[PDB]
Amino acid sequence: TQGLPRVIELFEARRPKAKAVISEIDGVVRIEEGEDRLSVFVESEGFSKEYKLPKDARLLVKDGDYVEAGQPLTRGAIDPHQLLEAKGPEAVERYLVDEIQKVYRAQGVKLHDKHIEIVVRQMLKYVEVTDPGDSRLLEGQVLEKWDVEALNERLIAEGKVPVAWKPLLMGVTKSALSTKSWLSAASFQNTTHVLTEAAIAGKKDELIGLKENVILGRLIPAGTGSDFVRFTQVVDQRTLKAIEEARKE
Amino acid sequence: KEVRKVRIALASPEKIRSWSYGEVEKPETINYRTLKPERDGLFDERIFGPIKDYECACGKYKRQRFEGKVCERCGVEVTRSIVRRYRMGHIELATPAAHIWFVK
Amino acid sequence: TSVYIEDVLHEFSTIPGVKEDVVEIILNLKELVVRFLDPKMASTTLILRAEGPKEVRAGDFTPSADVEIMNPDLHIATLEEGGKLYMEVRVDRGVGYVPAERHGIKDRINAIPVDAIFSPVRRVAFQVEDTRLGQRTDLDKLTLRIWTDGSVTPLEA
Amino acid sequence: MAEPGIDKLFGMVDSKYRLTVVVAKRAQQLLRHRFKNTVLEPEERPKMRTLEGLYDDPNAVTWAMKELLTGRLFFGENLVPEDRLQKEMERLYPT
Amino acid sequence: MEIKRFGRIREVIPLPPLTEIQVESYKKALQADVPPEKRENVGIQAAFKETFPIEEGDKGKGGLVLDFLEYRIGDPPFSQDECREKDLTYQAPLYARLQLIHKDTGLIKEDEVFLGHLPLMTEDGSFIINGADRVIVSQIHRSPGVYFTPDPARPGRYIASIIPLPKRGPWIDLEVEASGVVTMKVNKRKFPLVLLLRVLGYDQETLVRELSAYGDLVQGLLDEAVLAMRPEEAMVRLFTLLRPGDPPKKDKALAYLFGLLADPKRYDLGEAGRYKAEEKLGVGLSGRTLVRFEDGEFKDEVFLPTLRYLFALTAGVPGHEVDDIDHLGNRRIRTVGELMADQFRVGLARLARGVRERMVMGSPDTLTPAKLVNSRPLEAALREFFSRSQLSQFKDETNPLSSLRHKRRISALGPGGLTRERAGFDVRDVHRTHYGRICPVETPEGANIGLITSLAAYARVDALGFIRTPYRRVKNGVVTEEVVYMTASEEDRYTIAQANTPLEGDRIATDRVVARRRGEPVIVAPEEVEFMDVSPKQVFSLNTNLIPFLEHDDANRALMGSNMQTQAVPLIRAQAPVVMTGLEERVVRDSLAALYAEEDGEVVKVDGTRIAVRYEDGRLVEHPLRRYARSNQGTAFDQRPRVRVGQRVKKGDLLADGPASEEGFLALGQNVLVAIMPFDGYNFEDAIVISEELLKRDFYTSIHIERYEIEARDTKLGPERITRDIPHLSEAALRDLDEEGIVRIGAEVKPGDILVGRTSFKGEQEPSPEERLLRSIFGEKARDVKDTSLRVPPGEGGIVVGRLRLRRGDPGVELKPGVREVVRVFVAQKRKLQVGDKLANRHGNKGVVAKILPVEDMPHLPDGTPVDVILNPLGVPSRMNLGQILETHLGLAGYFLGQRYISPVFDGATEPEIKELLAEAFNLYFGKRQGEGFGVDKREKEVLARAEKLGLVSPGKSPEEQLKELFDLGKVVLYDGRTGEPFEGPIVVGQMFIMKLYHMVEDKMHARSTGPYSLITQQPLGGKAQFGGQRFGEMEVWALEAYGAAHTLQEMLTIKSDDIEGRNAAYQAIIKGEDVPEPSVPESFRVLVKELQALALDVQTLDEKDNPVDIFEG
Amino acid sequence: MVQVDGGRFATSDLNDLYRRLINRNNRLKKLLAQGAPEIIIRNEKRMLQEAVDAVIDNGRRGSPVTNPGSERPLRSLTDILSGKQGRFRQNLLGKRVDYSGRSVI
Amino acid sequence: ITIGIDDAVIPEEKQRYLEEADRKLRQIEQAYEMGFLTDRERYDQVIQLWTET
Amino acid sequence: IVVREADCGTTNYISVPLFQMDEVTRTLRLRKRSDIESGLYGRVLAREVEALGRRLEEGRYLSLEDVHFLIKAAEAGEVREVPVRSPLTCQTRYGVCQKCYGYDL
């Protein structure tokens, strides 16, 4: 597939048509049989993992070749969820960006990677718990807010459980969906679920993002509405010394 | 002080009534031939705000520094028309009623 | 500058026994060119009365003390059996092209102001040619042509 | 004919938005006192062409930027408290 | 001007009646001029027959029948115009001579009955419906037959589709699952096919005999031993399966529906269903998917033999192929006639149930037709169509062509049998076949691209909805005069030669004859050719046919100029283009916007009102001119007389012109002196530069007519009344109102001017005394009535040209409940080209006038003549509409040579001819300059010089001889108006026909500061005095977030919309020269919080110290 | 409650439901005061929940609260909030503006 | 600058270039009549001629 | 995601490559000029880069010259990746920092 459909496929972390098999394990390649049935083995010392192909499939490892942890066997597109678990979160990030660009580039478009990066990182915002310290053992949690517990219960109040987690490739939509602040969350496909829930828990916003404050009619937390700049006062020569002569009174 | 966080909760029947200003648990509203809101009903000036800016519904002191005035017979508070944007009402149910939200 | 027609109220009208309508009659009038004569003459008012099976044609206007219709002939309104007309057509002294929407006219009502195409000059061209006048093999012979609606002369223009 | 002296203006500040905020905050005071507040006065004040001669440009922000551009004003990020800021403000012919 | 005609191929057939689709369709559905004995099916005639041996409850015990004998079309109670005035639908009552019989006998033919009202089509092709001319567009769907198709959800497999005529049977699909099971899908219910096959009596062993050994496919269709049963029991189980509830053995009942009889599956009486089900399938057929009453048991006729081909395509010997669903031998055309008739079906269908309903409620002794028939199910079903079906557009009336072209439209959408606006891509593409029938060019640019199309000039929809193109049979060498229109399928079996092909006398002349077959372009021996194109005009639409050098225009820009012509508004000095294609006279003819003679006679009377002619002996008729009437799109249709007093008339020749017509030929615009060069950035991107000259000459100027309407209704508060007695109003405001409240004609109306006065009552309070005491003491009589008059809306205004009044009561007039009297005021407006308007040419070179220049500027020829419009070259190369360039060249000839041109499509001028004419022209143009006393001034010599350095003139030729060189290449030495100095290097200059389009800056362009805030949404919306208020979309919300524009965004979100508190504080500050804001709290916020409280839920707002704030103080 | 021309009105539509409810509460609130039949109060109580169901989220359960006349379902306190001009989304999506204007460029 | 039609100048090569292309096309059909080129082969060959020409 | 504080301080980075491996041919080529800039222009160096007798200091913002040089410097076989600061590894959570992202204002 090409064009915009690809860019969505990508930005949405979507397990495509012609997943074109990757080897789960390292090892040595062995193509076997033609026309009748086509299968490929990547068997190292110990394990012998077998990858049955369509037969029509245009595989791109010839017999004998040595192979890599998550290396493509077959051609086609690659599942970004299969890549996550086989070969980590960075390798994922690096696939997404470089593939998304593979199209804008291929066409005519020139844009900087950082944009795509900024977005891609958000696809990696959350992680699911395995064996917790405080909360229930299954919940999805923001990568940072788990460090708010991991490197918290292993320093000052050290002990209990560091909270083990798993890397969690969220598609662009899904990730947008699971977004802390209820105000923002409300604007998506089912506003009731949000509010119902957020009402039960004394949930609070804090209104960090923008989608939030525009909803309220508040002054956007960016540009001139950035905490880092909007408090800036300007005092004016004679105003300053005259303001100084009523301070020691 | 200035807002910095917003927190949603649930509504204690003691609050829903604390908000309320009056009870619209009484008939149904808007005169059509005149334009007066019907007494103790979904627009009753007596319970929300004066439909007109300051002023009562018959004749009182259209002042500014007197703060909170209620009339002779009718019960309208002489204090800006924006009020009707914000004053809450309530219907006191006779029995139960579940928020369908927390139900379905 | 504007017109009165007898039983006409706006431009988008028609007159019976007149193949023309007010619009098309006006597009005609525009072309009419009146030479003035008295220079005191700032603005006259021409009057044309027409009747019966007649081709009304500028020159069918009423002659006036200080007015010379420069392009008689020129169609105004083909009239069929039973056609009247009576026009009060006002000629003003102006310059350049003044759209009817700009000036307006209060020669009574049902007046329909008319777009003003004043310039007597009809077209101009000029010729920079080689001369025979005993100096350089690089001099100039100018000749401006000038065309006008005979109301003012090339020479005067 | 981009903003007059803006390259200089962007360099005056850390985050550009700060620039806006100052221009604004100044064009603010410079308005809420009839311009009896200028630092630039003499023959520095910005002006206007007309069917008439040079009149005092009536654009606060335009003035604000010319003003700032002369180093004659200061950006307190937190210098002089907001409670005392509206104090000695309404003083030198405000009403 | 004398006209020069171009090119060979002598048009064997003239274009067919054009609106043929519409006009001849109806006729054959309404045999109103044919005795009710003949009337051979189809149309209304059949739609009765399809319904009308109507029984009553029970099968042969209770009496009463009621049988159709013949229908009678009534007569129009209101003239074509009364209708459009009184707001009615041009109709005629329809009567049925029905006949109800009994069990004791009694043939009662009640003297017809009124079953409803039938809308009559005009001469035009168009309808009139509740005023307003509507057009029913012809739709296309799958031509009934049997199809198969591939299966989108399971690869390497197939489905089978049994599709009957629309509203004449159900959609039966056959598909085999991963189970093996074959499954019938009908009426969105799915059971195992076998069950049906069991009913039609197939036996476990007959099936294997018939359907085995290709594939292990039967094996699945088998195993249901459980119901490989008693064909009667099969029937019961299948009836329980199709209609859950009633479980008896009269399952023959329903099973007779998707079986025999002309109730449902009537895939044809004996036509394109049976026929094509035979060739594809295993031949030999009658007319229904199976036959029932063979003697009292069903006998299969299509189901199995389909299944055969279904299996025989899941492995299958060659010859058992898939089917091209997009072939026009698979696509049918529902014309008006049929849709209108299909709607009778719905009507009569309903009318029957409600007879059988009244056969049960009534005593059989007295029941009569008239007492059984209701007259409202036929009406409501057929009122609904002409009024509320998607296929019934208004009527694109901008210009003659636009209208004409409307009627010849074709669309795959529409009702039921029609794809949605979210399906079909294989459909959209111009499939091979469309050739000569549908246009490869006319479709709208986005959304419904390909879902709508133009019927082709020579195309004809036929007998059963197949479009047929004319061809020339060539008897092995000689091109015969015989012309054979033939199907999209009846074409894939011949070898047809192109028209571009030469000839000697009456026969093919060259040795390597070009032609196609099936689809492939093929080179062929002369003797090996069978048929011949009648013209290239075959291939394209009416509008696509009007582009004089189409051959040279890239097909994209062609489609732009094919439409766009349809946007071209008519002009006061409208003029037929300098370079024509032929149909321009005929387009105007078949549109009937122009008035033409009836029978060669002699004109007697002629004025702006009437043309009256004495036709040779045959009495005397007066033809009234429609004059400054207002087209649907506000355009101003108006006829002008083109004929003099006491003149003999040509058979049927122009008595009068239409709106976009010049002496009978099409006049969508002006031809005008053009120069293709850059100006000074004024023709940047697509912008055009104009010469004021054009305004002085009132060229591109056009008369638009608005239409205003007001109603007076009755009210719980009293009647809305149309007085001129409007309270408080100064007798100067009332000045233009007649004693009724309605503006005078010829009244000049500016915005905010009463157009129709109207007082409404309204009870907005009661005045408490003191005020009542004050009222008398100071005179002005307290009034019971508010102002609420009509008034001209901001932006509008012009001359009042006609009023219209309709009163509840008044004869034919029927306004909606409440509405009592309606007033209509019509307002004309001369327009005139304007910066912001858009001119286009035939080759799709659209663009906006961006600067008018006074003639002092403007490039000018040496003779002095200025050009008119300055068109930018940079426009040409990227779009590849080279025809415009050629058109300028031929045009330049014309100017000098004094002629217009007819250049056919793919048959018009060639350069050889064009340059010959440019030659002839320069010879007169320069012959003048010499004969007047001149020649080649320094300015041209300085150009002509560098002109050869540019290899554009032959060196070693005279400046005069070099001038011609250029004039022939079509360029000239232009002279800069601003500065007499010549443009360095020659410019192509010439006459180009250019149109003024539907859009104008007048109607656009709006600007608000403040005012009318809605009481519902509280954001500015609508404007009685001041107007408008622009939307800030979510896309713009982004931009402001993208820029750092905090306050600016917040401005757009508060003080210029809902925030009452804020806007008020802001506007009270701007009035007083204050800074504006410090907006207390975004209203948005308050609103939401409260809108939350209302739903329970506290929503605490809290500062950084985490305590509460109260964003309200009250 | 806004008056369309004459004595025709534009009632909020939520206002409607907010009565449907006060009529039940006052019916199933009278019954109980004098004359309390078992089965009768039951259905009235089944109605008063259902009436609050409507004000909150009309569309649910299955039967939508129609209006004497049309079958259009009429908006609930949920819809006020449930996007598209619905309080949460009105801002980031719409809003007509007070110093604007357009024209051909 | 302007675009006149003679500004869409065709190269003196095109005629011959197509005569040449024509000739080679005759040599392709003949080569299939024998049997050198399969149905497909000969198509490909015809297509790859025009692409080049 | 908003630039919220100049530099989070973290010391991971990204290694923008200047060569590409064609899975079809297994071969490596130095990537299209255009794309290189799109990975580098306006980036901040994560760790120093020395090549062609030039040291690029830690946390230097790379101009278009710099990139252009870096590509020259890769063809002379001295540079294969560029250790660059990126939003992918910035550590301010609720937005990238100033020193990540870097530039493209």
Ligand SMILES: C/C(=C\[C@H](C)CCCCC(=O)O)[C@@H]1O[C@@H]2C=C[C@@H]1OC(=O)\C=C/C=C\C=C\[C@H]1O[C@@H]3C[C@H]1O[C@@H](/C=C/C[C@H]1O[C@H](C[C@H](O)[C@H]1C)[C@@H](O)[C@@H](O)/C=C/CC/C=C/C2)[C@@H]3C
């Ligand atoms: C989209 C559509 C109709 C639209 C209103 C018009 C088509 C828009 C495409 C375009 O102009 O680019 C569909 O049309 C029909 C059936 C289902 C679809 O219904 C639809 O999706 C939508 C509406 C269908 C019918 C609506 C009928 C009524 O709506 C209004 C009053 C009734 O008539 C409508 C008038 C339509 C005439 C149009 O005519 C066109 C120009 C303008 O679009 C209009 C003047 C002309 O160029 C004309 O040649 C085009 C005709 C379109 C032929 C399509 C027929 C199938 C008018 C907009």
Ligand SMILES: [Zn+2]
């Ligand atoms: Zn009172």
Ligand SMILES: [Zn+2]
């Ligand atoms: Zn960082």
